[PDB]
Every structure is written in structure tokens, then in C-alpha cells.
Design a protein around this nucleic acid. Sequence first.
RNA 1: GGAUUUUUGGAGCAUCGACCUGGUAUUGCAGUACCUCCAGGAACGGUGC
Lengths: 80, 82, 383, 123, 144, 95, 162
Amino acid sequence: MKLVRFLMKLSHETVTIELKNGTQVHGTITGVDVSMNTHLKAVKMTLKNREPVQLETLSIRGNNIRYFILPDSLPLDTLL
Amino acid sequence: SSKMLQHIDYRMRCILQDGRIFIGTFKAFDKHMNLILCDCDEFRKIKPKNSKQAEREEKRVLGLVLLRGENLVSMTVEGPPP
Amino acid sequence: METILEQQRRYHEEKERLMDVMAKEMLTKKSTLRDQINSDHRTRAMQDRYMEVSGNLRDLYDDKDGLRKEELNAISGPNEFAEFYNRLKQIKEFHRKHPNEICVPMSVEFEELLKARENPSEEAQNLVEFTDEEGYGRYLDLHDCYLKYINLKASEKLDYITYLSIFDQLFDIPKERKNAEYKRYLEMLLEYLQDYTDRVKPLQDQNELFGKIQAEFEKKWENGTFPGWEERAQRLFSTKGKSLESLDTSLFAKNPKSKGTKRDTERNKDIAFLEAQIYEYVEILGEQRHLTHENVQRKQARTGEEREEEEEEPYWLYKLHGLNINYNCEICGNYTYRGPKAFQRHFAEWRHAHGMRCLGIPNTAHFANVTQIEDAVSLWAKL
Amino acid sequence: SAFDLDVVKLTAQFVARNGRQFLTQLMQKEQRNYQFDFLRPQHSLFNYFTKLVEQYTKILIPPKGLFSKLKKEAENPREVLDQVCYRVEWAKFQERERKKEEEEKEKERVAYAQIDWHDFVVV
Amino acid sequence: KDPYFMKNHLGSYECKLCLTLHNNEGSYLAHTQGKKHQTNLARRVEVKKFVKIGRPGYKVTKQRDSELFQIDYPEIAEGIMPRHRFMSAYEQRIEPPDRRWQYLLMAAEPYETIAFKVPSREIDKAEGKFWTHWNRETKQFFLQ
Amino acid sequence: PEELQKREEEEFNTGPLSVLTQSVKNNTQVLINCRNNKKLLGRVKAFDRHCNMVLENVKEMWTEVPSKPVNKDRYISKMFLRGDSVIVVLRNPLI
Amino acid sequence: VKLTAELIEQAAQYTNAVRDRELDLRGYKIPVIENLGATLDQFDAIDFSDNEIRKLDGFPLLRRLKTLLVNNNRICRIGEGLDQALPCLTELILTNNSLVELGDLDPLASLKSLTYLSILRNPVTNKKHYRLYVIYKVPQVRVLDFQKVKLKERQEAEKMFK
RNA sequence: GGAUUUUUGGAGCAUCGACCUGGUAUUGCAGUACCUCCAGGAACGGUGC
């Protein structure tokens, strides 16, 4: 089974997407597509050796994301 | 869904892979993460390379810019459609 | 300005309105925990505003002791009152009534049906001070503290149940060394936990509780709070025993005990104060910790579906019938009609009869197609 | 309505510093060719002027802030919470008394509509 | 069970929801499926019987006031106050002639009603909550 | 369909990702190297053909130069890692 | 009519002729400039033509602004905290003002990144040694009233008022 | 939805823009990459190695 279907069924979850170029955006992920496009609202982004700015909305691509961090209160058996 | 088309024709700032930020009115998009930014302005930060020098950002306006998905990293909304 | 007469009465009326709003909030029943927490936060904000108003009104008494000799004098009086009435004799051309002298503090300290929040507390939100895992004071988030403890211990042999059992101790032996760096994390896990004391009960006095905790730490914890029957007296800073009380009193002012060690009363006093505050927070909020441990056990013992269920909680009809066609009727005050048949039906009606009765024309069949007032007057005069 | 409210507040401030009931700063002003219709009790504004005079008299109390400082109302949230609970209990007791009075009125109306009005006796 | 299809007086079918006609039975069943049919579907005694009556002797004392009658009643041991009401002389047990006056009668539950005739038209008010009083400590009833 | 699912199961049980199938059989920890020189050791709950892994109770260690670099590490409860940044996946770690 | 966020949100913000983001606010007659922080630092030029602003003050912290157009106004006084609000200011158009004294341009030397200045059609330029005092006050300005600074003018500014 | 163009990863030197001084010819109607040349100073910055 593909791992994109498990990530597509996630809404209103405070996740942290760490990008490839030293960027990490922590926020409530509101939308996920089949191409791993993560659209989040009211997030905080921290770049490589920079101050963490706050954005009202963000849309990270699939190839630009390096890793993800989920909360502890998220079962993985029902999502797969 | 259609979350990418909800923020169309607004003053959005897309972060590039090299560290620059292109702010413009994203009028057209596609499935390959392409963007058509009308009246776009690209801002790139410069290194101070000293102990007392500050960090500056050179900004240049280009107009209509067709940015491919290979360099686009993340796009954030900055301003409403005028 | 009447700072002793008008301002003091206004502050007393504002305090009475705040007390009435607090009594109306306390008299109303509660149905949810988040709404009760929001009502408690609004009551705490109203009590803080009333305390600020009382502190502002209690400081306006310096000139009152000098003005009471002239205000209570019976020789004076209506001369200054007549001068103030002549000063209040300005232009009354501003025809506007202002009933919001006392109704506006009554409406500002009230809530609406769509949103149960006051007007100063309209921007308050329960999601900006508590997380979703806490449940607005129902449980405590201990995943980040367990991750920090697993990172500090550098071992994967500590689960959530082991961390909950290690955190449940109050006066037992610690799992790590007191002079290590993990105690520097033990303040940080207390740094939100004391914030839980500001989260689980916003209506309680935090300053008086902090003063009582400081008095219990200074007068009792610094003078041998744990007696014995080395085991007679134990010191939290030096981590050493004592033979008697006189030996402990002589060693309390010693040179290694003051500043001649790495865990003396000079540098390790804040760590001991944070440990005492964490112990007081664990003793005061032990039921919330037990509820969080029961919720963690119920989440670990459930399946994936149970955990997922727990985590989720017409133009053609207007064109054929002759509608949408503007017609002007000069008899009934130049009214508009959207149809010839509608105007013919409204001609033999009560509105057209009441319009024609003002001109003196009787309601007959000759004035059915009459529109202008002059033509109707000529038809009435010709008959 | 701001000028009339300001005049009523000025009259309540001038009448509160009097040494007697009839020897005030507004009784002599009535004979000084100054029209003041708010002094008569027949007007509807007299009920508000009396409440303003009562508030001005309560603002001159020794615990009102002239010669003493309140500590239980200004530096004790638990005392304010106990006062709010006592006010809520008094409001609940007043609501229970109003419900008992309404039940007694309903019982009297039920008893009056069932008695015999034909057994007349003239003594 | 369609509540809109009915039978007319000519042996046909009529849809009152869309107001349509159908000659045969095969056209009425085919008229339910369509655009206009879907658009029309989307667009559309105990206290009186238990009262004890022994009829005791009342004690009323009248007095002409100027600016009131006092009725001495025994202890009733209840919260029900005695009520006064003004009635006419047209209704009676035997209906005597020349009855064209009014009578104010005060009645209680353990006692009988005491009535006083008023020859004047209006000299007072017989309202219960306005000008009546009943002291339960001394059991004194007054009405003015 | 069912035949494609059986072929994917055979390719996951007997192919190069069979060591990843060892991660979901006995719940053993694996060590994955990232492109940013950050080694993540932990158990793998779910995998795919594109090497996208779902890690539970993972520990990520790396070298950060302030001198000599220190071994700063972190511990995450649940995480997801894409297959584009995976360099080398070791089935049996040392410690 | 006072200036607020509703006048800035309904204004036309577009690209100017100098390839910069400019918001047109001509024909407003605003007596005071306030609540200008609703742009979220998304503009580089602010036009204030045909206004009744008596004093140029009350400007929020904007780092993206690089041009100020205060032409056709009635500014008699100048604000002092202009350098702390616009650190990247380069162009200043203060033409058609009511400046009379030479001390009004003393906070105007607080901007270190200022290079363009325009004080034409003003009574302050009618006085003697006005350009020399403007060159001696702010040496970072290279173009004053559509004219480049001179080395002899800089020597006369350094020699005078010593 | 995994095989080169987008989405399951290649991760002190040279050049250009300026800043300031003098002579020099063009006075000209267009949507222009930039726009005359020489000489002198610089203790200005960006890019790649």
C-alpha cells in the first residue's frame, strides 16, 4: 500500500513538516493531496539559522518536504 | 481537493530552493507546481561576510514570471487581490 | 472635575456592576468544561478589572482631605453652583439622547446568545492557552516531558508508564543524580506545571498561593522539613545527613554549605525551589495526574479504531404574465406597479380607495381607470 | 438628555453636602429665580434624582474611600467570590419567594372561582 | 402511494402537484419521472365539592368613613384569604321582585358569606388586591 | 487488484525491502540515514514501494559543529520520512 | 474625513513606473497620517498627494518602504522619529510644503540611507545658504532638489557654520 | 503516480553594478535589454572558485 493515502486522511492536526533546505514549518495541516502537497493554516516556519516567522497560510510541495512529525495522540493502525 | 485554486489571483510569496522569495499575484497554476506570478518581485538575501555587517535583501521586480515546480518549495499568502 | 463625588460614585457603580455580572455568571448552570473554563477566565478578568478600579479609586484621597473643609461648609454653596449652572448654559442644539450612561456598562459586562463572552473578553480564546491533548484542564500533556527525559537519560528502557511512575514520587529517592543536568530539565517540566496551576483554576489567587509556597519553602523546607527517628535531619541542598539539630544549625552557616560546593545554598537554591514547586504542584494536582495516567492507559490498551474514535472527539413566468414592467400611479403618491393586471386589481382595493378619499372623490366605477389627480378631479366635478 | 442628567448630577452633588433636610443648597436656589423642575416629586426624573442623591450620600461613607481604604473588596478575590455567591443565593431566595407568591395567588384565584356566590346573607 | 395523482370526472388522471392531465394509465406513471415533477417535489371542581359549609354566624361592623367594614372571623388555619366580590341582585334562590341593586359579599372557606347591599352606584372599589386587608395574627378582615 | 497486491507482497517479502519487512515482523529497530547527515534509529510501522516510512519512537542523531562537534540527538514519538532522502537503511544496528 | 485602515484597504495598490509597489492615495485631504500598518510591509512607495497633513508624523515601522511622496500638502512641522520607522528610506519628496525655518530639516538628517530629497517650492529654500545647510546637515544625500551635490558645495558647507 | 525536462534529491582570483572630479559632440518624438569617449581617486557592494 502507498503511504500517500495514509497522509491524505489527516485534517486539523498540528504537525511539523521539516523541509529539505533547513526549513521546518509547524502548524495545523488542513489539506493533503496525492502529490504530498501539504496546505496548512496558522503555522510557524523556521529556516536555516533564522528567526521563526508566523504565517497565516502555507502550501509546501511534495518534493520539497524531507520529513514529517506527528503528535503522540495519532493511531497508525486505523490510518493504514 | 481544490485547495491550490482557493488562493488563486492573490498576492502570494513563494519560497525558492536557492533561498529567494518571489512575491506576486499567482494567476495560473498546474499539477507540476508551476506558478504564473503577475508583477512579481524576487528578493534574495545577501551574506554579510563580516562581524559588524548586517544582513540585507536585494529585491528586483520582473513582472510576469513563470516559475517551475523544480525550484518552488513553499508558498505563503501575503496580500489580498487588489 | 468631581474626583471625590462623581468619580468615586462611578467606580462604585462599576464595581457593583462587576459584582452583579459575577453573581449572574455564578448563578447560571454549566454544561461543558470548556465553557466553564471560559466563564472562569472571564470572571477572573472581571475581578482583575474590579481590583484595578478599586486601586485607582483608593488613591484619589489626597486632595479629598483638603477639599472636605470647603465642601462641607454651609456658608458656601449656591454661589459656585450658580456659576457652574451658568457654565452649563451652553447651546442645546445637539438634539441627541444618550441613554448609555448606565446601560453601556450593563451591556459590556454581558454575553450574547451566539457567543457566551463579554465585551472586554470578546478576543479571548481557550485554544490559545491550552492544547488539544490537555482537554481544557481535564488531562496533562506529558509526551514532550517523557521525550526530554528519554533524551536526557540516553536510554530507550523508559516507557510512558515508567515515566509516570517516576513522576509520581514526592519524597522518595530520585531516579537520577541531584547534581546532574537532568534537574535542569526538572524545572522546565515544572515550568508548565505551575502554569497548569494557572490553567486548572484561573479563579484562585495565584499570588497568595505563591506567597504561601514561598513561606513554606523558607520557614519549613529550609529548616528541616523531614524529621526522622544521618536519618534524623536531611538537607535537600547538601544531600547529607545530620546527627542532631544543633549540628545542623552549626553546619547551616558553614563554608562548604554557603558557597564552597557545586550544590550549595547560593547556586542550587533555584533548583531546590523549582523542585519544591514541582512537589507542591504534584500534591495539589494529583487527581489530574491520575486522570492523565488513566487516559494514557486507556489509549495504550485500546485498538486503532478505538483510538481513532477517541482522537476525533423564473423569467418566463414574469415575461409571459406581463410582470417586471414599471407603471406609475400618480393617485397613491406616485406608487410603482409591476403589472397591468396587478394595477387593475389594486385599483379596486383599499389602498386606492384610501388614496382617493383624501381628494374627496367617492369610490365608484367611473374612476377605475383614473390615474392623475387632475383628471379624477375633473371627472368628479363633471358629474 | 445629557444636560438634564448633568443638572441632576450637580443637584445631587450640591444636596448631599447639606446639614439638614430643608436647609440645602437647592431649597434656597428655588427662591433665587432658578427654574428647577427636578425638585418636585411629581416628575418622573425625581425617582432618578433621589437615587443619585442616595448614591452621593453612600459615596460619603467612611468605608467609601474618604477616610479609610477597603481591603476585602480590593485585595481578596475569595471575599468577592463569597459575596457573589451570597448575592446569587439571595437572588435564588427572592425567586423562590416570588414563585411561592405566584403559587399562593394561583391558589387564591382557584379558591375564589369555586366558591358559591349565590348564598347571600344580609344581617 | 402517490398523494398527488387523482381521478377526474372524465375517466382520466390528474396531478395536482404539477396540475397536469393524463388520458391513459400508462402516461400517469411516466409523468412522475421528469424535470417538472422533480421541481414540484423539491419546491414543496374538586375544591368546590370538598369545601365544608356549616354556615356560622358572622360578625360584621360597618362604619361610614371619609377621606370601611370590619368582619371578625375565627381561625381558619389555612393560607386562603377570604375574598370579596360585588354582584347583582338579579340572581337569587327565589328571585324576589324589585331587585335592582348591587351587593358586596365576602366569603371564606370554613365560614359563610356575608353580603352588604350598596344603594349607591360607585362610592368605593371592591377589588381584592387594591383596598382589602386580612390580618392573620388577629384574624381581622377589612375592605374599603 | 488481487494479483498486483500478491506481486507487491512477494516483492516486499523477497525483494530489497525485505529487511523493511523485518521491521514489521518482529518489530525490530532499523537505522535510516538522511541526506542532512542525520541517522534515525527506530521501529518502522508502515512502508511502501517508494521507501516512505512511518517511524514510531524514533531517535535522530547528528553532528553539529559549534572546536569539536557534539552528538546532539532528539527523540520523536511518531514521524514520517519520505523515500527521496533515504540513503542507507541498516536492519540490525549496533547499539 | 480622517485616514484609517478602510481608506488604505480600498486604495489602488499596483506597480509604479519605477518598478516598485505603490499605493495611490491622491485626493483624500487627510489631516493626520495614522494606522498605516495595515499594508504588512508589502509596499515600497507611499503617495500622499493633495492632503491637508499639517505635520508628517505618526508613521508605523515599515522596513520595505523606500520612497515617500508628501508633495502638494501643508506640512509646517516635521517629525523626529522618522528614522526609527523607515530604516530603508531612500527617496523623500517634500515638495510644496510650508517650511520657513532652517531647523525643520534637523530630524531629516536622521535617515542614514537617504539619498534622494526634494524640498522645492518651499519658503525654506528662499533663504540664504539653504542648500549648504542641507548638505552640511545630511551628508548622505546625493541628489537634493533634482541636483547632484558638489565638492565645492561640500567644502563651503564644511567651512561655513564652524 | 518511484529511471535524464518538473513530484520520491546532486545531496586571494575573474566579472558586474555603482560613488566622486574636468574637457568633449548630439537639442533628438517613443514603448527601448545597456547606451558618446578619455583621464584621476576610492578607505562601496553582489556573484562563482
